[PDB]
């Protein structure tokens, strides 16, 4: 999967409007490799943690947590939340091949971020489809 | 190796009644306290459920999970997660730190609002921490 012209200009303004609702810090599109396809940080936010490691590490993720995804009965999980203390995070499928994070603090609350999450994962998702047919 | 807590005697049934009430009030299918080895430490599932997945390998599956995040964890400034939610079109599973060395893990379905798993699961979690700290 490759963003560039319009759809990535249209996944960028996703994710701007997304972070705008949520109060989220760090929005990113990512494949499941972990490659970084578009990616919007909150103004107000600190800069953020290196977001290649950050989208390495949760491609890993979402590849095994699928041995525990079978056992429940599904080819694996469609969202996880991982909520530390302070930070969390929020993952969705944008169809088929893609991931939305969103990192958040305490500052967003979690239903706006799932919310807006899940309609945000819709968007990026159609993007996605357009550009790879 | 043997577990990082055993539960037995009084500790034990309250843990078990804990797991049964949370089952009740949440509407999820199975409830269980494990280690961070992967070991069932007390488990109950609810009476109208069917026969659950193997239990050990689900425990070990979110135990092995439970060691994987602390690299992303640390990555976003924390030592580890305290709670995790994986939500399949129609399972789902709760994770939630009871105390240092153990979890509770509540598996559910559809019918198990998510709001009522997460508000139960935290106060479950909580009454586990102090029956394992002890
Ligand atoms: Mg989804
Ligand atoms: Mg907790």
Same mark, same amino acid.
């Given at each position: 999967?490759?963003?560039?012209?319009?759809?990535?200009? &249209?996944?960028? #303004? %996703?994710?701007?409007?997304?972070? &705008?609702?949520?109060?989220?810090?760090?929005? /990113?599109? *990512? =494949?499941?490799?972990?490659?970084?396809?578009?990616?919007?940080?909150?103004?107000?936010?600190?800069?953020?943690?290196?977001?290649?490691?950050?989208?390495?590490?949760?491609?890993?993720?979402?590849?095994?947590?699928?041995?525990?995804?079978?056992?429940?009965?599904?080819? &694996?999980?469609? #969202?996880?939340?991982?909520?530390?203390?302070?930070?969390?995070?929020? %993952? =969705?499928?944008?169809?088929?091949?893609?991931?939305?994070?969103? %990192?958040? =603090? #305490?500052?967003?609350?979690?239903?706006?971020?799932? /919310?807006?999450?899940?309609?945000?994962?819709?968007?990026?998702?159609? *993007?996605?489809?357009?550009?790879?047919?």
């Amino acid at each position: 999967l490759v963003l560039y012209g319009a759809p990535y200009e &249209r996944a960028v #303004e %996703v994710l701007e409007e997304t972070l &705008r609702e949520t109060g989220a810090r760090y929005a /990113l599109l *990512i =494949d499941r490799k972990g490659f970084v396809l578009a990616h919007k940080e909150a103004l107000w936010a600190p800069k953020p943690p290196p977001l290649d490691t950050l989208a390495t590490l949760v491609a890993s993720n979402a590849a095994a947590t699928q041995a525990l995804a079978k056992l429940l009965g599904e080819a &694996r999980f469609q #969202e996880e939340v991982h909520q530390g203390e302070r930070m969390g995070l929020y %993952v =969705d499928e944008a169809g088929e091949h893609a991931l939305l994070v969103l %990192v958040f =603090d #305490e500052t967003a609350p979690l239903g706006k971020v799932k /919310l807006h999450g899940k309609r945000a994962a819709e968007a990026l998702a159609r *993007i996605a489809e357009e550009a790879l047919a």
